[PDB]
Each structure stands twice: as structure tokens, then as C-alpha cells.
Design an enzyme around this catalytic site. Structure first.
Site, short mmCIF file in Angstrom:
data_model
loop_
_atom_site.label_atom_id
_atom_site.label_comp_id
_atom_site.label_asym_id
_atom_site.label_seq_id
_atom_site.Cartn_x
_atom_site.Cartn_y
_atom_site.Cartn_z
N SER A 175 0.82 -1.20 0.00
CA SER A 175 0.00 0.00 0.00
C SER A 175 0.86 1.26 0.00
O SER A 175 0.34 2.35 0.15
CB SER A 175 -0.90 0.02 1.24
OG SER A 175 -0.10 -0.03 2.41
N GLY A 176 2.16 1.12 -0.11
CA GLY A 176 2.99 2.30 -0.26
C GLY A 176 3.65 2.72 1.01
O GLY A 176 3.86 1.92 1.91
N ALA A 177 3.98 4.00 1.09
CA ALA A 177 4.67 4.53 2.24
C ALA A 177 3.77 4.44 3.47
O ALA A 177 2.57 4.69 3.42
CB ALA A 177 5.07 5.98 2.00
N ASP A 178 4.36 4.07 4.58
CA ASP A 178 3.62 3.92 5.83
C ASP A 178 3.28 5.31 6.37
O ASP A 178 4.18 6.07 6.73
CB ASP A 178 4.46 3.12 6.83
CG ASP A 178 3.65 2.65 8.04
OD1 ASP A 178 2.82 3.44 8.53
OD2 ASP A 178 3.85 1.50 8.47
N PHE A 179 1.99 5.64 6.40
CA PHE A 179 1.56 6.97 6.82
C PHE A 179 1.79 7.23 8.31
O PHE A 179 2.03 8.37 8.70
CB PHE A 179 0.11 7.31 6.36
CG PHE A 179 -0.95 6.31 6.79
CD1 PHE A 179 -1.35 6.20 8.13
CD2 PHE A 179 -1.60 5.51 5.84
CE1 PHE A 179 -2.35 5.30 8.51
CE2 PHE A 179 -2.60 4.61 6.22
CZ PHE A 179 -2.97 4.50 7.55
N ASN A 228 14.29 8.50 -0.93
CA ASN A 228 13.75 8.31 -2.27
C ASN A 228 14.88 8.26 -3.32
O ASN A 228 14.84 7.40 -4.17
CB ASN A 228 12.69 9.36 -2.65
CG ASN A 228 11.29 8.96 -2.16
OD1 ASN A 228 11.15 8.43 -1.09
ND2 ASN A 228 10.27 9.23 -2.95
N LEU A 267 5.04 5.06 -3.85
CA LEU A 267 6.40 4.72 -4.10
C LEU A 267 6.57 3.24 -4.39
O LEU A 267 7.40 2.85 -5.24
CB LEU A 267 7.29 5.16 -2.96
CG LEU A 267 8.78 4.90 -3.14
CD1 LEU A 267 9.31 5.62 -4.37
CD2 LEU A 267 9.54 5.36 -1.90
N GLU A 287 7.19 10.36 -8.16
CA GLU A 287 8.24 9.77 -7.34
C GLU A 287 8.76 8.51 -7.95
O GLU A 287 8.10 7.86 -8.75
CB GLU A 287 7.65 9.34 -5.97
CG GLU A 287 7.24 10.51 -5.13
CD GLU A 287 6.66 10.08 -3.76
OE1 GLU A 287 6.81 8.90 -3.37
OE2 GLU A 287 6.09 10.99 -3.10
C1 CAA Z 1 -10.74 9.68 -3.40
C2 CAA Z 1 -9.73 8.58 -3.48
O1 CAA Z 1 -9.72 7.84 -4.45
C3 CAA Z 1 -8.70 8.36 -2.38
C4 CAA Z 1 -7.33 7.96 -2.94
O2 CAA Z 1 -7.21 7.06 -3.76
S1 CAA Z 1 -5.94 8.76 -2.47
C5 CAA Z 1 -5.25 7.77 -1.18
C6 CAA Z 1 -4.83 6.42 -1.74
N1 CAA Z 1 -4.29 5.48 -0.78
C7 CAA Z 1 -3.19 5.75 -0.07
O3 CAA Z 1 -2.66 6.85 -0.13
C8 CAA Z 1 -2.55 4.64 0.76
C9 CAA Z 1 -3.30 4.35 2.07
N2 CAA Z 1 -4.07 3.10 2.05
C10 CAA Z 1 -5.38 3.04 1.79
O4 CAA Z 1 -6.05 4.03 1.53
C11 CAA Z 1 -6.06 1.69 1.81
O5 CAA Z 1 -5.16 0.74 2.39
C12 CAA Z 1 -6.52 1.19 0.43
C13 CAA Z 1 -7.65 2.06 -0.12
C14 CAA Z 1 -5.34 1.17 -0.52
C15 CAA Z 1 -7.02 -0.24 0.54
O6 CAA Z 1 -8.02 -0.36 1.55
P1 CAA Z 1 -8.29 -1.71 2.40
O7 CAA Z 1 -8.00 -2.87 1.47
O8 CAA Z 1 -9.68 -1.60 2.98
O9 CAA Z 1 -7.18 -1.61 3.61
P2 CAA Z 1 -7.27 -2.18 5.14
O10 CAA Z 1 -7.92 -3.55 5.13
O11 CAA Z 1 -7.76 -1.04 6.00
O12 CAA Z 1 -5.77 -2.46 5.64
C16 CAA Z 1 -5.44 -3.28 6.77
C17 CAA Z 1 -4.51 -2.47 7.66
O13 CAA Z 1 -3.33 -2.01 6.97
C18 CAA Z 1 -3.21 -0.59 7.17
N3 CAA Z 1 -2.52 0.18 6.11
C19 CAA Z 1 -2.81 0.12 4.81
N4 CAA Z 1 -2.02 0.96 4.11
C20 CAA Z 1 -1.21 1.58 4.98
C21 CAA Z 1 -0.14 2.59 4.88
N5 CAA Z 1 0.20 3.08 3.65
N6 CAA Z 1 0.46 2.97 6.04
C22 CAA Z 1 0.12 2.46 7.25
N7 CAA Z 1 -0.85 1.54 7.40
C23 CAA Z 1 -1.54 1.07 6.32
C24 CAA Z 1 -4.65 -0.09 7.30
O14 CAA Z 1 -4.72 1.24 7.83
C25 CAA Z 1 -5.17 -1.20 8.19
O15 CAA Z 1 -4.70 -0.98 9.52
P3 CAA Z 1 -5.63 -0.82 10.82
O16 CAA Z 1 -6.60 -1.97 10.70
O17 CAA Z 1 -4.62 -0.96 11.94
O18 CAA Z 1 -6.22 0.57 10.66
#
Ligand code: CAA
Ligand code: CAA
Ligand code: CAA
Ligand code: CAA
Ligand code: CAA
Ligand code: CAA
EC number: 5.3.3.8
Lengths: 263, 267, 267, 263, 261, 261
Positions: free
Chosen positions: E65-69, E92, E117, E149
Site C-alpha cells: 500500500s505504499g509509504a507507511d503513513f 527516495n 512509491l 516519485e
Molecule cells: C478519493 C480517493 O480515491 C482516495 C485515494 O485514492 S488517495 C489515497 C490512496 N491510498 C493511499 O494513499 C494509501 C493508504 N491506504 C489506503 O487508503 C487503503 O489501504 C486502500 C484504499 C489502498 C485499501 O483499503 P483496504 O483494502 O480496505 O485496507 P485495510 O484492510 O484497512 O488495511 C489493513 C490495515 O493495513 C493498514 N494500512 C494500509 N495501508 C497503509 C499505509 N500506507 N500505512 C500504514 N498503514 C496502512 C490499514 O490502515 C489497516 O490498519 P488498521 O486496521 O490498523 O487501521
């Protein structure tokens, strides 16, 4: 005027300089001197002011199976070193023929009547336009299987015409670029869907369509446009030609390809 | 290990791979196979992990008068249709040898130093211009690229190296009118890093003196840094040199095939 | 602020600078001064800090049939030695206008979106191929570059844009034989990012529908990121485009001066 | 065959195509149409198979004082906009003439009989070889003083022929490239050290030496070598030409240069 | 010899150096030091003369899922600039460089989506195999207040075309399976269930072992060395410019706001 | 608005943004954070629409002896690689980039010798004026177990020629006054005593004020914008490669040994 070659003929019909590979019993496999001869024919077509298109046609079921392996075995018995030998036998011939295609100023059209392999397939990829006889054509670049590397400008032409990732899959694992991948990348501009048993009818049909297509065109425009188009990648091709031929030397000198060329 | 060549020797002293042109009676004129041999020696030096510097030295009053014209006449008289065409002949005799040796210099990873003990001409002078550093014996050295007089064009990467190391305008004056790049021009462009100001009659002493100074200069240096820096510096013009090599060798073919240079090589 | 042009209008809605070709009765054929006007509008949009997207829309069944041939005939009949030579005339009438408008597109910093409501031809089709994103009204759109039929060569950066966006081989087939880049080819190369599949009889509805979707798509985005990303993406090919522009415009001159295109423009 | 121009003549002597700026009373200042005319003469020399050298000579004490400022004032009174006007009057002419010099295939030699300024000095910097009458010649590129930017490929040619740092000092502060700096950079291949009062004798003496220098040379080699040499920087020049002419527009449209051209 | 990392393991089997992202519970999100670690692993594989292929595999339903937020929030410094130079720029430029210059054949086993990334790194691989048609790549820079990036400035137009790249990047839209397949980005879709990345990973390795049989492996590398030279300069130039130009976005603060929610 | 730095000050006089290295007792040796600070100052000058020239001046007898070796000894990290990415890679890529892209006319007042990264920065300036004929530039990479830095891969061959560059870099020899003057690297030698950098600095500013009179300053910038494009790609490519390739030297340890003595 040029020497005759029993494996490759040419003629001129109007604005078309037509080169014909005429050794179907040997799948139009080509020796070093035949590649040189091809280069000389391109250079002749290039100097003829009445020629606007240089059309490469072949015979039988293969466009060309590539470098003649018997001739390669023959090149193993005069030279002070292995290096000298391969510089003369491989380096010289590859740089020359690849250069002749890269710089050619006339529109280069390949009539692909069947598969092409190795250096012959590189030359197909250097043509401007490719027409296929049917959907059984493919291009194979078996360098990884022969203990060689990219030849004939394929370093540039394959990523350019097929994409980088596809090129790596095919080259790294010795897999063909098949009809479907050619069509998907717009490498083939028209599939004539004729039987493999009549290259001759295919060849004639392409020429017949070409005569119709050029009618009304201002042919010097074709060349003026090609001159500008060529400039997009001319430097990359010339750079690749030099490095390809020199980097391949260590493979020949090591001996691996000779072993493998001899199953 | 490599075959012997009675015109060119080599040895290794510490981090120095030393190549020596040893045919002063013929002004170290070189035949095709000698150029190839030079390329092979560079490739040998390049594979030797103890070598950091490849030093090219010559003998007598000339560094090298260039391509051996007797050998060129040799390659004209046929015996008798050994080649199917003039093109095939020149692809094998000129194209192959030039692209190979030029490439060996262009890609060489060790620091390449030329000890210029006298004038260099033609393809030999092109190889000088491909070296990283040049030291001169005295102010009588010159480089001559007589292509316009021979019915030829740029060779050995000179299409790139001359404008790069001497400037474009000076390059056109010298090449278009068959005029030498003289000592003063070399020095004004920083082409020569040191003039030793020794007599032309003792190339040997000059050669020894350069090696002596080099042994001093390397002391205390981290030699892998030399090579690391060269690797980056080379990338400034590597593409231009590789492109020029291919084009030079192929474009020269029509001059050979036309016959003009053979006429002129024979006066 | 800028002069008015009865063939081309513009307006700004939020972050969108919207240009509208509004001469459907003449298939939005454009004269030299109209191309210049287009360049000026791009430059106006480019200087407006509230604009992030420059959207080009047209009217009727054609996006644009290209250069207005009546205007070209105008520029042939002299009145009477207004220009000292054919060269001077074509430098002013063709060279100047093409280099200017092509440059305006090549360097534009805002996201450039073409709403392709029908076919485009010639220099107008070149401008389409310079846009960053293209949306089509339906599967009957095509681009035609009829240079071989007109006695001309590549224009508006097509030397670069066509091989880049359609592949080299397809480009040679289309350009050498005066064949259109049809919908299927556009779609196979990802040239069209969305086909709206609307009837050709309502460009207005198509135009509105694209703007409506764009308003939705930008929501939540950080718009300066769009521009920052475009700034980097543009650097991939900026040099090639600038080199091609100069060469295209100068090399076309001999075709105009020879007279062939004028003959052919007049059938 | 070409129209006549009272300010610029030409002739052919053997392999030399000789262009002569013949308006010494006005310091060979040139109007737009005169720059176009120069381009057309280059293109004529380029198409003549007997020509190997294109020699540019002038008259009086100046090579050329640059663009004719009276003509520039004249270009201020027909166009739908300031932009349209300058595209036609400046952009068109500069791109065309600069292109003609950049691509010219014959050896281009400048006989520098005195100073050159502005676009004329750019053209001197695009020549392959420059000979000076005496050590009082200089090149001035007064763009910063005129409210303009680099022209005629100077973006590339000045750093290439004089070095980057020197180029910045001269361009940023409107200082001349003097004889000494020209000689130090090998920009001048020979100083004839003749009096400024006889350009004509200088011109004739260069031609006399040139006739002697070409004897015994294989002239097609000169052109073959130039063809390869040109390829070192051809892309940078073509890219610069386009951006120079288009980026200068905003300066013209803003009005600053017109003010300054009118002291 | 290298430190251990609980989120990323590696091993060597014959000519294959296999890197395994092993943190499926967090969708293999990676912190700065994890990206650095990935670079170090590539550099280790690159120095090993028995290795001809470097294979990157992951775990669970996401490739990464990329960089750890959380790590970004976690991120002493004399200025915001100094901070971001150290935290973002450095990492980077280093990891992107490691991928750009890698001399071994780099193969990505794409077991699910990749983002940011991590998705940039996928686009730098030479060959990509997909588990099934649900994979996608997302580059959400416009939504995060960032810019390109990991060499995406070059790799996306190169591998997907310029127009498609603009549509996806400008509007924060994924490069979906269909777009990947139409551009030949994926060389083979294995069409396996998302619930067994392990089986997918093993199956790719099995096919690879079969495909290399009879090949002269130094040819693979010799060919890659030439192929790499087509775009090496563009990638090196983009790396430097990407990393420096992103700084003003970090320093402005927009991404930090958005990385929150 | 920017933090203060006791080693480097700045001020603005008309169209001139003047940066002053003010630590003569330590020969204006600079630590990592000082290089970063220099970058930030360039970026501040670049954003100021009234500034047309950015003038770098120093103090005492040296322009700058280069990187502060005490700070290097002074230089938490999971690996040597991670450490050097943060300490060296980041800082070098950032400051070099700031100089490469700077849009204002960059003028160096060279009041004495410059060494190492500081000398690289001098070579990135557009115009250099020397206090007297005792100035030199030294790039001691070969003696330190390092490689080219700060864009020197490009700037030295460009400004001094390739052959001269090799002699100086390979053998750790200075680019002396004479070599600088013969290559037009120095546009004017003021021939003032080394004991009054201040007077030199003031004299350059005085001449600059005179030289800009009557010029249309936006032309200076417009011209620089075009001139910069001749080598911008080569500099950006070199920056990335220099910073990454030096890593193996730091990680190997050789420079640290040598930086000691
Ligand atoms: C309008 C839009 O369209 C929004 C956008 O696309 S812009 C943002 C795009 N995504 C990002 O920037 C990366 C962040 N990750 C995400 O949004 C989501 O993981 C995703 C949409 C990619 C997938 O969703 P999902 O399959 O439901 O993920 P999920 O089952 O919650 O993940 C399991 C765990 O890993 C975590 N995780 C996933 N990505 C992570 C990251 N980059 N950093 C830290 N933790 C992360 C989740 O937060 C979750 O942890 P908790 O249960 O402790 O909260
Ligand atoms: C397919 C793979 O994936 C394998 C590889 O990559 S490794 C290298 C691939 N192949 C090559 O490099 C060269 C061989 N090319 C071929 O096409 C193989 O001959 C082939 C077996 C695959 C074709 O089979 P085919 O269509 O039945 O042709 P085949 O009967 O072999 O050839 C007809 C004649 O032309 C000859 N010929 C064909 N190609 C030749 C070449 N490159 N050199 C010399 N002779 C050749 C054959 O020897 C044969 O002569 P005989 O009648 O005296 O036996
Ligand atoms: C005005 C100009 O700028 C003139 C030009 O020269 S343009 C043509 C360029 N010249 C060439 O291509 C190189 C060939 N060599 C030469 O021209 C002349 O040897 C030179 C002027 C360079 C040197 O002058 P020199 O010292 O008088 O040479 P010379 O005494 O002949 O050399 C000693 C021996 O080496 C031989 N030799 C030298 N160079 C040779 C070569 N390139 N090939 C074969 N043999 C060569 C000579 O033939 C001579 O052998 P013999 O005594 O058995 O005949
Ligand atoms: C086989 C091929 O591939 C053929 C080729 O066409 S090669 C030559 C390429 N064509 C051109 O250069 C563009 C010029 N336009 C055309 O060729 C044709 O208009 C077209 C085939 C593209 C469209 O066909 P169409 O819908 O029948 O056009 P048409 O009905 O003439 O247009 C409506 C009006 O707009 C006018 N118009 C359209 N394009 C114009 C232009 N470029 N300049 C001036 N007027 C134009 C027409 O003259 C017509 O006005 P009138 O009714 O007053 O005569
Ligand atoms: C030197 C600096 O540093 C100043 C600058 O950078 S700003 C711009 C520099 N100069 C220019 O751009 C154009 C002017 N060029 C010149 O050489 C100036 O005329 C000069 C005063 C410096 C030369 O002085 P000079 O040698 O005495 O020549 P001058 O008497 O002016 O000229 C002879 C004739 O040719 C004319 N002429 C010369 N250059 C001309 C031009 N570019 N346009 C139109 N007419 C011109 C003069 O007007 C004069 O005509 P009159 O006899 O009708 O007056
Ligand atoms: C064989 C060779 O030829 C050696 C080489 O060139 S390779 C090494 C080249 N130099 C470097 O790498 C930079 C280090 N600096 C120096 O070596 C010397 O300053 C120099 C040779 C450049 C000049 O020598 P100098 O004029 O006698 O300097 P000096 O008067 O000692 O400087 C005054 C103070 O500034 C300090 N200083 C100078 N450069 C410094 C740096 N880069 N970091 C930290 N402190 C520094 C000095 O150590 C001294 O401090 P202390 O009195 O507290 O010890």
C-alpha cells in the site's frame, strides 16, 4: 550495377526498388557476405533518385531463418587471434549491414511471408512498415539460447516497437514475438491473410496495393517526412550499433556461441 | 596472456600497464592487425584488477606516422577475388579494424596516459586524442589528421574528440586544410598536461622520466577513486563517441570504395 | 484581455480556461491569424494563476478541417510585389505562424485537454496530438495528416508526437500513404482517454458533458500537484519537440517555394 | 538565380561561393529582408555541387553593426495584434536565417573586417572558420542593453566557442568579446594584421591564401568531415533556434526594445 | 551479510535472489528505513556473481500500500527543509537509484495492488507477472499534494503512454489490469485466487526454473546491460529532479495535512 | 524569513542578494547543515522578484576549506548505508540541486582558495572574480578516498577541459590561478591583498553597481534561462549519480580513515 548473388535478387518497378530473398529451400538463411550484399543493395537503392520505396520480399515459408550456421562453422579454420577473426567475420559484417538499414533514406517496407530469426529478424524491426502474409508469422531473437546478445539495433528497435517489458520477457527467455503481440503493438500495418504456400502471390498483391496507394501522392513528401522521422532515434541506433557489435565480441571469443551453434 | 607482436610490447609495473610501440625505424607506422593488437592490449589491461593506469609510449622521433601505407597497398592487390566486392573488402580491412580499436579506447576504464615522444598522424593521432592525459617530450610534437589530403574523413572518434579538446573553429581550420595541431595549440587548449622539454633523440629517457614522476604522483592516493572518478567523467561523452564511431567507419567506406584514397596513398 | 475573434471564443469557469472553435459552417477551418490567435489564448491561459486546465472544444461535426485553403490562395495572389521573394512570403505566411502556435502548445504549463467532437486534419490535427488528454465524442472521430497529398511534410510537432503516441510503424503507414489515424488505432494506443459515445449532431452536449465530468474529477485534488507533475512530464520530450518545430517549419519552406502545395491546394 | 540586393552581392570563383556585404556607409546594418536574403544566398550556395566553401566578406570598417534600427522603427505602423506583428517581423526572419546557417553543408568562412554586433555577430559565431583583418575586431551582443535575449543560436555558440563563464560576463553586462578573448579561445584562426582602411585588400588576400590552401585536397572530404562535425551540436542549435525566437516575443510585445532602440 | 528486517526477507535459490515482503497485516506498507533496506538488498543481489534474476514477491492481498503513513506522522532539525531532506529526499533518491542501476533481471510478482512509491518500484522492474485481473497500480500524488516519485516521471509515459499517464496522474486514477495488459506491462497473468499469494509466488518460481533451462545466463545480463542504456540518463535525471522538486510540497505542509485525513 | 546561522549571513541591496561566509577563523569550513542552509538561501533569493544577482562572498584568507572534518567525525542508524544516505547523500543532492537550478545570476567573489564541495559550488557559479593570483581550487577526492561531488563530473571538464580535469583529479592537484585564467574561469582578477577580503568584497559590489546601470535586468534572467538549458540535464543526471556512487566509498570506510589522518 552490382555483382549477382544467387540467393538475393533485385529489380526496380517505377518508384519501387524491390529486393527478393530467393533461397526458400534453405529458409533464406544468410551468410555474412549475403548480409553485406543486402547492405550494398540498400545503398544502391538509396542513391537512385527514381526510387522512393525499398521493398524487401522473401520466398517460401520463412522470411529468413537468420545467419547461416554452416557458414559460421566454416568461419572456424589465417587470423592472428580469435579476436581478429571475429572482428573480421562478425563485427564488420553486422555493423555494416545494420548501418545500411539505419541510415536508409527511402521508405523501407518488409513483406513478411513467414517467420524471421536472429539478425534477419533485427532487419525486419528496422524497416519502417511491415505487412504480414498471415497470422502465423513471428519474430524470434534467440540470443540467450545462442550465447549472444542483441544484434542489428534490436537494443533500440524492440523496446521502441514492442515495449520494454515485453522485450525483456521475449529476449531474456528466448520467446518469440508472435503475431498477436505484433498486431497489438501496431508493428504489422496489414495482415493479408493469404496461405503460406504462396509467398509469390502475397508479394505480388502487396506491390499491387502499393501501386494503388501511391497514386496522387507527392512522393518527395514521403522522403522529406521520413528524413524528419528518422531523426527521432538516429543517434540511439548509431550508438547501439557500435556497442552491440563490440560487446558481442567477448561472447564469440569465449567460444560459447560456436558450441551452441553446433547443437 | 596474448600473442607477441614484434612492433608493440607491453609490461606491468605495479599499478601501471605499459604499452610500448617499438618500431622506430618505420616511425611506428601500424598495420591493421597492429591496431587490433593495440585494442587487445587495452582489453587485457582493462581486465587486470591490479592495473589502474594504462600508459602508451613509443620510440624514436615519431609517436606514430599512422597507418602503414605499404600494408594498405597489400590490402588492395587481391589474390585475386578473395573478396566478392570492393565493399566487402573494405568492410573487412578498414571498417572492422577501426571500429574495434576505437571502441577499445572509448570504453577503457583505466586512466589512459599518452607519452607523446614526437608527432602522431592519422588514426594514431586519433588514439592520442582519446587518451585522458598527454605528456609531451618537447615543443616540436604535433598531431596531424591528413584526411582531406588522403581522400578520407574523420577517424578514431576525432569527429568528437577534436572539437571537444581543441575547439570547433580550430578543428575546422586544421581538418579542412590539412594543417597540424601544433604544440602551441595543444598547450593553449590544455591538451598537454606537461611538457618535459627533453631532446627528441632520447624517447627512452622521456619514457622513463614520465614513469618516474607517475610513481611519485600516485603515492598516498586511493587508486579506486581514480577509477570511480573516471567512470563518471567518461559518461559525459560516451554516447557521442559511440555514435561517432559507427558513423565514421561506415561513412568512410564510400571514400575507399570510390578509390580516391588508394590513388593518393600511392601518390 | 485580448482582441475578439469571431471564429474562436473563450471563457474561464473556475480552474478551467475553455477555448471554443465556433465556426461549424466551415468545419472550423482556420487561417494563419486564427492559429496565431489560438497561441495567444494559450499564453493568456498560461499566465492566469487561477487556471489549472486549458480545455479546447469545437463545434459541429468536425473538430477542424485544418488550414483554410481559401486563405492560402489569398496568401498566393500578391498585391503585387508585397514580398521581395517567394521565400520571404512563405517565411512570413507559413513559417512564422507554424513555429509560433506549435511553440505555444509545446511549452504550455496547464493541463491541456482536447474535446474531440469530430475529425481533425492537418495542422489542427497536429494540435490535437500535442494535447495531454483527449476525449472523443464517438467512434467516428479520426485524425488525418494529408501532407503527402498536399506536397508538404510534418507540421506542428507531428514528427515527434505521432511516433510517440501511435508508434513508429503505424505513423509511417498513415503519413506515407495519406491514411487516417482512426478511432480504433487511437483507442489501441490509449490516445483517447474516454469515448463518450454521443451522437455527432450534438457537439454542445458532448462539450458540456466533458466539463461536467471534469468538475467532478478535480474535487479533492491538490491542483498545484497537477501542474508540478506536468512540469516534470513535459521534460521527457521538450527538447525533441523544440528541435522538431524549428526543423519542420524550415524544411517545409522548399515545398512551398517549389509551388507544389499551391497547385494541389487549388486541385 | 535570385533577386538582386543592392546591399549584398555574391559570386562564385571555382569552389568558393563568395557573399559580400557592400553597404559600408551604413556599417552594413541589415534589415529583416536583408537577413532573409542572406539565408537565401546560403541555400543557393548549398545546392550548388561545385561549391565547397561559402565565404562571407564585408566592406568598410565594420563587418556589420547588426539589425537596422530605422527598419525596426519602420516596423511600427496591418496586424491584428502586437504578437502577430512581431511573429511576422522578428520571429520569422530570425528563425529562418539562423536555420540557414545552422544547416549549411559547405564550409562557412567569415572574413571579419571589423566589428560585428547583434544578430550579425551571431552569424559570425555560427561560421566554421573566422579570419580577422586586425586586432581591433570585436563581437558585441548588446541584448541586455536592448531589452532582448540571445539570438541567432548564441545561446549555444557563445558558451561553445568562448566558454560559459566568459559568455555570462559578456552577455549579462553587455561587454564585447574582444580580439584577445577571440584569440585565446581559438575563435580566430588567422589574424591578417592589415589596416582597417582596406577591407578589400584583406578580402582578396584571404581568397588568395584559400586558393593556395585547397590545392591537392580532396574537396569532398571537407564536406564529408563537416557533415560529421555538424552532428555534434545540430540538435542543440535547432532546439535553441526555436526557443530563442519564441522567448524573445514577450520582450518585443512588452515594448522595452522599441523604447531602447529609440535611444 | 546484512541486518535482518522483520518486514522483508530474502533468500537465494540457484540463480534467483528472492526478496519477500512479509507484512500482510499492514498491506506491506513500508517506512523509510524499509525502502532503504530494499535498496540494500538489491545492491547485495547485484554484487553476487551467482545471481542472474532478482525476484520481488509479497504477501496477502496487496503487493504494497505504499509509504507507511504512521511513519510519516512520526517524522532535531534546524528547519522543515533540513528535516525533509533527511526524511524524504535521501531515502527516495537512494532506493530509486538502486532499482534504476540494478544489473540483474528484475522481476515483480504482483500479488495485489501497489500504491505510491511501491507502485513506482513495480514500474521500474523489467518484467511483471500478475496473480489475477484484480491488480492495479495507483499513484495518488495529486490527492496527497505531492508529485511524481520513484522515476515515474519517466517510467509511466514509457510503459503506459503519455496520454494515459496524464489521465491517471492528473485525476488520481488507477492503472488497472486492463490498461496494464493492453500496454504489455504484465507479461503473464496467472489467474490465481487472491487468497493464496504463496501459491502464486511458488508457481512463478517454478515456471522461471523451467524457462531458464538451456539459456546462457550471462547473455541475459549482457542484453540487459545494453537495454538499460536506452533510458538510464533520463531515469537518473528524473530521480534528482523528482526528489528535489517534491521538497517544496513537503515544506509547504499540504501532504502532512492530507496524510492525516 | 529564514533561521539565522552564525557562520553565514545574507542581505539584499537593490537587485543583489548577498550571501557572506563569516567564519574566517575556521577557514569557512562548512558542516552538512551549513550546506543545506546555503541551499535555502539560494532558494530564498530565487523566489525574490527584486533579486537579479546572487553574490556569494567569504571572509579571511580562504573562500572555504570545504566540508568540516570535525563534523564528519561527529557523524541511531540501522546500517552504515542508512547513516550515509542521511548524512552525505541527502545534503549533497540538495545543495548541488539548489545551485544547478538557480535562476538568478550567480557570482562568486573568490577571496582565497576553495576546496572539496565548496570548490564544486564555485564551479557551479556563472561568474567568478578573484581577489588575487594566489587563489586556487582543490578537489582532493582521490586523496580522501571519494569521487566527484557537487556536479564536478560535469563542471570541471566543461570549464577547464577534459585533459586538464583528469590531471588535476586523478593526481589530486589544484586548479591554480594560471589554469583558471587561461580557461576564462575568472572573469576579473582584482589584484588586492589577501589580508582584506572585506575591501575586495566591497570593491566587487561597487563595480557591479556600475555595470548594471542602463541594463534591462529581466534580459539577464531571460538569457540565463536559455543558457542554463545547454547543460541542465547533464548536471541533474550527474548529481544523482555522484551522490549514489560515493556511498560505497563512505560505506567501505576509507574516507573516514583518511579524514582522520
Ligand atoms: C478519493 C480517493 O480515491 C482516495 C485515494 O485514492 S488517495 C489515497 C490512496 N491510498 C493511499 O494513499 C494509501 C493508504 N491506504 C489506503 O487508503 C487503503 O489501504 C486502500 C484504499 C489502498 C485499501 O483499503 P483496504 O483494502 O480496505 O485496507 P485495510 O484492510 O484497512 O488495511 C489493513 C490495515 O493495513 C493498514 N494500512 C494500509 N495501508 C497503509 C499505509 N500506507 N500505512 C500504514 N498503514 C496502512 C490499514 O490502515 C489497516 O490498519 P488498521 O486496521 O490498523 O487501521
Ligand atoms: C524455437 C526455439 O525457441 C529454439 C531457439 O530459440 S534456439 C535457435 C532457433 N533456431 C535457429 O537459430 C536456426 C534454426 N531455425 C529453424 O527454424 C529450425 O531449422 C527449425 C527446426 C525450428 C525449423 O524447422 P523446419 O521449418 O522444419 O526447417 P528445416 O527442415 O530445419 O529447414 C529446411 C532446410 O533449410 C536449412 N536451414 C534452415 N535454417 C538454417 C540456418 N539458420 N542455417 C543453415 N541452414 C538452415 C535446414 O538445415 C534444412 O536443410 P536440410 O533440408 O539440408 O536439412
Ligand atoms: C603539408 C602537410 O601537412 C603534409 C602531409 O603530410 S599530408 C599526408 C600525411 N602523411 C601521412 O599520411 C604519413 C606518412 N608519412 C609521412 O608523410 C612522412 O613520413 C612524414 C612527413 C610524416 C615524416 O617525414 P620523414 O621523417 O622524412 O619520414 P621518412 O624518413 O620517410 O621515414 C623513415 C622510414 O619510415 C617509413 N615510414 C614512415 N611512415 C610510414 C607509413 N605511414 N607507412 C609505411 N612506411 C612508413 C618511411 O617510408 C621510411 O622508410 P624507408 O627509409 O625504408 O623508405
Ligand atoms: C483519401 C483521403 O485520405 C483524402 C484527403 O482528403 S487528402 C486531402 C485532405 N483534406 C484536407 O486537406 C481538408 C479540406 N477538407 C476536406 O477535404 C473535406 O472538406 C473533408 C473530406 C475533410 C470533409 O468533407 P465534407 O463534410 O464533404 O466537407 P464540406 O461539405 O466541403 O464542408 C462544408 C463547408 O466548409 C468548407 N470548408 C471545409 N474545410 C475547409 C478548409 N480547410 N478550408 C476552407 N473551407 C473549408 C467547405 O468548402 C464547405 O463550404 P461551401 O459549402 O461554402 O463550399
Ligand atoms: C558600445 C556599447 O556597449 C553600447 C551598447 O551595447 S548598446 C547597442 C550597441 N550599438 C548598436 O546596437 C547599434 C549601433 N552601433 C554602433 O556601432 C554605433 O553606431 C556606434 C556609435 C558605437 C558606432 O559609431 P561610428 O563608428 O561612428 O558609426 P556611426 O557614425 O554611428 O555610423 C555611420 C552611419 O551608419 C549608420 N548605422 C550604423 N549602424 C546602424 C544600425 N544598426 N542601424 C541603422 N543605421 C546604422 C549610422 O546611423 C551612421 O549614419 P549617419 O551617417 O546617417 O549618421
Ligand atoms: C598530499 C596533499 O596534497 C594533501 C591534500 O591536498 S589532500 C587534503 C586537502 N585538504 C583538505 O582536505 C581540507 C582540510 N584543510 C587543510 O588541509 C588545510 O586547511 C589547508 C591545507 C587547506 C590550508 O592550510 P592552512 O592555511 O595552514 O590552515 P590552518 O591555518 O590550519 O586553518 C586554521 C584553522 O581552521 C581549521 N580548518 C581548516 N579546514 C578545516 C575543515 N575542512 N574542517 C574543520 N576545520 C578546518 C584548521 O584545522 C585550523 O584549526 P585549528 O587551529 O583549530 O586546528
Amino acid at each position: 550495377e552490382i555483382r549477382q548473388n544467387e540467393k538475393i535478387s533485385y529489380r526496380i518497378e517505377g518508384p519501387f526498388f524491390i529486393i527478393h530473398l530467393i533461397n526458400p529451400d534453405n529458409l533464406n538463411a544468410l551468410e555474412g557476405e549475403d548480409y553485406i550484399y543486402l547492405g550494398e543493395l540498400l545503398e544502391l537503392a538509396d542513391r537512385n533518385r527514381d526510387v522512393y520505396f525499398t521493398i524487401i520480399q522473401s520466398s517460401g515459408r520463412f522470411f529468413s531463418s537468420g545467419a547461416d550456421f554452416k557458414g559460421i562453422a566454416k568461419a572456424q579454420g589465417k587470423y592472428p587471434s580469435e579476436t581478429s577473426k571475429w572482428v573480421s567475420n562478425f563485427v564488420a559484417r553486422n555493423v555494416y549491414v545494420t548501418d545500411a538499414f539505419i541510415k536508409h533514406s527511402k521508405v523501407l517496407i518488409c513483406c513478411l511471408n513467414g517467420p524471421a530469426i536472429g539478425l534477419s529478424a533485427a532487419l525486419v524491426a528496422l524497416c519502417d512498415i511491415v505487412y504480414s502474409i498471415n497470422d502465423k508469422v513471428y519474430l524470434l531473437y534467440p540470443f540467450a539460447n545462442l550465447g549472444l546478445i542483441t544484434e542489428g539495433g534490436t537494443t533500440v528497435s524492440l523496446p521502441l516497437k514492442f515495449g520494454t517489458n515485453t522485450t525483456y520477457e521475449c529476449l531474456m527467455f528466448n520467446k518469440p514475438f508472435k503475431y498477436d503481440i505484433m498486431c497489438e503493438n501496431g508493428f504489422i500495418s496489414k495482415n493479408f491473410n493469404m496461405p503460406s504456400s504462396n509467398a509469390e502471390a502475397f508479394n505480388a498483391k502487396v506491390l499491387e496495393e502499393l501501386r494503388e496507394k501511391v497514386k496522387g501522392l507527392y512522393l518527395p513528401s514521403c522522403l522529406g517526412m521520413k528524413k524528419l522521422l528518422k531523426s527521432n532515434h538516429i543517434d540511439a541506433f548509431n550508438k547501439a550499433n557500435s556497442v552491440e557489435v563490440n560487446e558481442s565480441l567477448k561472447y564469440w571469443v569465449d567460444g560459447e556461441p560456436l558450441k551452441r551453434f553446433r547443437q
